[PDB]
Amino acid sequence: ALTQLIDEASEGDMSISILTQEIMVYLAMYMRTQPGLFAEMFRLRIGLIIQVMATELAHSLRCSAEEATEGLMNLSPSAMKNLLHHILSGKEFQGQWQRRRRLDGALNRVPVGFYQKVWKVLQKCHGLSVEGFVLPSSTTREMTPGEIKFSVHVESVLNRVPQPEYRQLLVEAILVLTMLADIEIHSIGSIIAVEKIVHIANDLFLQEQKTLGADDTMLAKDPASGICTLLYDSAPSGRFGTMTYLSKAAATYVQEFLPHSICAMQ
Amino acid sequence: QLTEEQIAEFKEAFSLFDKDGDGTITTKELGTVMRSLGQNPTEAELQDMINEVDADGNGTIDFPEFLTMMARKMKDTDSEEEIREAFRVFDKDGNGYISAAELRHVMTNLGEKLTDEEVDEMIREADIDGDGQVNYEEFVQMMTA
Amino acid sequence: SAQDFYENYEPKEILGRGVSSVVRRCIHKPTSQEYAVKVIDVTGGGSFSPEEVRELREATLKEVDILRKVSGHPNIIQLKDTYETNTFFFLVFDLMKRGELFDYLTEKVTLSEKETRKIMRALLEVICTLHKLNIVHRDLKPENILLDDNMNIKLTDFGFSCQLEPGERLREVCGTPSYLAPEIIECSMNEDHPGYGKEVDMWSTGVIMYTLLAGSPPFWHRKQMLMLRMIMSGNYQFGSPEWDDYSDTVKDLVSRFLVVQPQNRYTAEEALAHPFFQQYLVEEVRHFSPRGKFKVIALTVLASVRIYYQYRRVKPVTREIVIRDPYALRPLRRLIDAYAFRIYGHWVKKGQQQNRAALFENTPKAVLLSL
Amino acid sequence: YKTADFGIWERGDKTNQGISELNASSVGMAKAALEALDELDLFGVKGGPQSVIHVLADEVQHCQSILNSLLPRASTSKEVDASLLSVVSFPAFAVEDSQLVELTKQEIITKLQGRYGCCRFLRDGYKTPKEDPNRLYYEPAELKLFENIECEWPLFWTYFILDGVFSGNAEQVQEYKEALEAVLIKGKNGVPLLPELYSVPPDRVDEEYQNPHTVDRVPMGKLPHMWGQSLYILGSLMAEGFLAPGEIDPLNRRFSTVPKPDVVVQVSILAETEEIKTILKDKGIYVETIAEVYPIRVQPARILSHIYSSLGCNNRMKLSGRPYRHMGVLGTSKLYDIRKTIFTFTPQFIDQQQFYLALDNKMIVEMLRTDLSYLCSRWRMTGQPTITFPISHSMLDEDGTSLNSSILAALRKMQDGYFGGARVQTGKLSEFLTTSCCTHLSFMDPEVARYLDHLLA
Ligand SMILES: C/C=C(\C)CC/C=C(\C)CCC=C(C)C
């Protein structure tokens, strides 16, 4: 049945069917010998693994996706295993962090305990909405924080954004609520749109660079997401990092929903 | 750049802070001092206060840590306020002149027993303008020195 | 022989990995004591040509030598004994349950002033022993530094070390790029400079100071040669908002190791004599002139007043200051760095394209894209 | 290890919705049963090879790979189950790492035990007064209704008593004996009865919601619980010196937690043709050819899998023997005695007809490196494992006159005595005849037999 499911999920393309099971051996090979590469991935998505492995072998030896598709068939099993380990371990051979966010939100790689941190935040809220799909606080009572079924619910909401790079922006956006939630004594008591916090953070990332001397050329919009391409390439921390602007926009949204706030314990 | 002298001055100050020879200054110990000098802050205040300086240290300040504070991290305004404050701490009278006896008042407060003439001498050694008084200008000139 | 290896130790689990060397935990059967074994593949899977196979042995044969020249010292591992085979070279040393300082620096992005002081107090006292025996490391990276359950520093991988003949200065370029002293590159780009001596380790140690206390290398940028001009010229900045909260005694000692000219560098013996590493010994008479007593009582007051003033100054976290500038104030900036390294702590590794500074954006995009 | 089942509680996952899951109790129990039946004569001492149950350590240690990964959890849906006491200590002894046993036992302690026994698993609600006894299934929302008010079964306290007797913790056999003696319901002529479960009274459900494990519970369910009652008497028998752990465990499963030293993996590199023996000789590799090993004859791992398809065949009972399952090194590293001819089977990762992972020589070393590592740490048979490694023409260079560097490094690596964390004693297959697991395949003793008949001749 497992082989039949792979073949049916192969939608007829025979090259992916073997690559699906070929990677499955390597995933199990690294899982048995190095369990630490999957500590940040609770769902092993082989199907996109070929896709995410395609992009890095596309950017390396810069070529088209179809040439990479022909290229992916061409590597040796050891090279294929190494390149997958190149993907999973976090070793690097658009932009630097744009290639580290298209490789971090396409694998649905999330920090240890992030699914155990959404549970804490949702108890202080009514839900968490992404692209207008809500993950309500009723889930917190329904499954335990450590329940993998809950991990699916948080995960399912987070794939409502198709583009991989924007998902990781949502991922660390969720955590800037978590870290602001600890400081804030009161609860928002309403819905929070995790998507929007990135958007004004995109907007607020826009204003500061305009003031400091950025041209319209460098701050170019991502066609689908609506985020500046430089914001995707921006480093996480720092004065002008992505999570400084998202630690910045995770407060103006709480301004309208929470008229009065008290922040303690620094 | 802090001289062997300066480091030594910071060290004896650390000694004046800890009555026990603990090698550390506790939230309680700082307190005994502030109250010695007349600023009685909440035991909680103290905890925060020792925390601002250390951040781990479990409420005890250490000397390597101590010097870190006494090195002039202070801004001109910031120090100015402080320099001024000590000066007031010095004059309960608030007359604005440093009594030889006022110096004694502070030591007596810090539990160090030192000779009466020596005290006059301490001021005298440092005293030119204020015969018998250290003026604030003398105090500031002195601290930098 | 391999029989001699298994007659005394039994490797249980894999601790770490390397380019061709694997670190493995073992049990010493006679003593039942935890020990680490580094397992270097001499043949390297067949990639090593006979020259590299020979050179790796000579590098390894040398490597036993330095680790045999320094022993019993608290803060460098003890090579308990070394076994060589035709295909491997086993080296058994102390077990460090915790990993390298790089892994630790990933967990805590900014390493606190008290913690770094004893960390490097050992490292400088490590550096004194190497220089007194006249042995330079040239490789003082935090991944070369191992920490135990008590956080004690165990300097590791003297793989690039070489003993200078009295008054001789090397020319070979040995070391990953960021932690190379200015004359390392200068000797690489010129023949007139007759070489570098034991003062090399001082610069590398001073680099750890900027990395540990700020979470970034002093000089880092994504292309290779650009980092080099920041090194030889020596343009470093205790930038804001990051580097303003630390005490001023930190900054001067950082510049001392970071001076570009070697002779003016701050050698290890006087390095421990800078005010930071001064320790409070309880039993000191500390006699003082009457002016000296008056300062102490004034300084004792000046301290108490100071502490109340500094604290009063700290601004509680409010909604507005988060909106205007999160990084500016410490508690929120350290937090942003902390949750920066929890999400992308897998993205920091060894090398140039994986350094920690890649996780920090301290400059406007326009200035970054100026050239 | 690869089959989902409803398990010890006949309800599958925590949701109780007919969803079978991989429970550690089933995986652990099968591992112990497989080890218990391993070379066991079902007729006792007065038995023969016809009455011996043959168990393959590939499936036994595959259950270990799942137990180590699952524990201290019972499944992906259960953070812990008190039935894991039936796996860590008794009667399975299926966990070999003592740290795992203590960690799992203490996890049961914190999350399940109260003052009336231990809960089967978190959010159980089997007989909690907050579930309707008519519906066989539970809706998803009902799971949160069972929190902290779950029925508590003294059955698992008999397991802790049994664990203490086996481990030798007189303190453990005392804390759980007085605890069990205060929950035992007296009946008939004063005999103790073990309640199946202790249930929260319907009015007092809210109190245990707020303050956990303090409200008085009423005995419900089966009275006596014939399962739990037996181990209570069994624990009582072995705690008052009427029975020893060895008599109830004659197969010595209780020693599963004692450390096992790693084994020395014997490797006999072979050459498919004489002309490959010269390339290896030119590189200084002492090998026998495939023909020089005769009378010992080597075969692919598949052939061994076909052979076991005749073990347990009974036409009248319509039993077809073992299904075709892939054979790992633990099966293929034994020496097989089929019809008085010694058989060694090539390890499966070198099989080239199945897939293309054997056609990359850099992958042979990588698979071999882990496969020796799997062998040394997981060998539980008499003798030392013997991997017969035949060098094929595909493992040579594209030129055809030189051995590939990756395999070339691999072969010398084995002669020096260490490869992949395993001690390798390289030699000839004849030398390892007496220091190997010589398993006699008695079912072959008078399809695959017809092939083996010509193969023998
Ligand atoms: C101290 C925080 C200051 C601006 C940020 C505003 C915080 C919040 C708006 C609500 C988000 C999470 C809540 C968990 C309960």
Numbering used by the authors:
A (entry chain A): 875 to 967, 1051 to 1223
B (entry chain D): 4 to 148
C (entry chain C): 12 to 382
D (entry chain A): 176 to 621, 659 to 669
Q: What did the original publication write about this model?
A:
Phosphorylase kinase (PhK) phosphorylates GP and transforms it from the inactive b form to the active a form to initiate this important biochemical process. The 1.3-megadalton PhK α4β4γ4δ4 hexadecamer consists of a tetramer of tetramer, wherein four αβγδ modules are connected by the central β4 scaffold. The α-subunit serves as a bridge between the β-subunit and the γδ subcomplex, and facilitates the γ-subunit to adopt an autoinhibited state. The γ-subunit bears the catalytic activity and consists of an N-terminal kinase domain (KD) and a C-terminal regulatory domain (CRD).
Local refinements were further performed for the αβγδ and γδ subcomplexes that display good densities, resulting in 2.8 Å and 3.1 Å reconstructions, respectively. The γ-subunit features a KD that can be further divided into the N- and C-lobes, and a CRD that contains five helices (αJ–αN). Notably, Leu78γ, Leu90γ, His148γ, and Phe169γ line up and form an intact “regulatory spine”, demonstrating that the KD adopts an active conformation. The CRD wraps around the kinase C-lobe. The αJ helix interacts with the δ-subunit/calmodulin whereas the remaining CRD (referred to as autoinhibitory domain or AID hereafter) loops back and inserts between the C-lobe and α-subunit. In the KD, N-lobe residues Phe16γ, Tyr17γ, Pro22γ, Arg35γ, Phe99γ, and Phe101γ together accommodate Tyr593α in D2α; whereas Asp52γ forms an ion pair with Lys588α. Importantly, the AID also binds to the kinase C-lobe. Thus, the AID would inhibit the KD activity by competitively blocking the binding of the substrate.
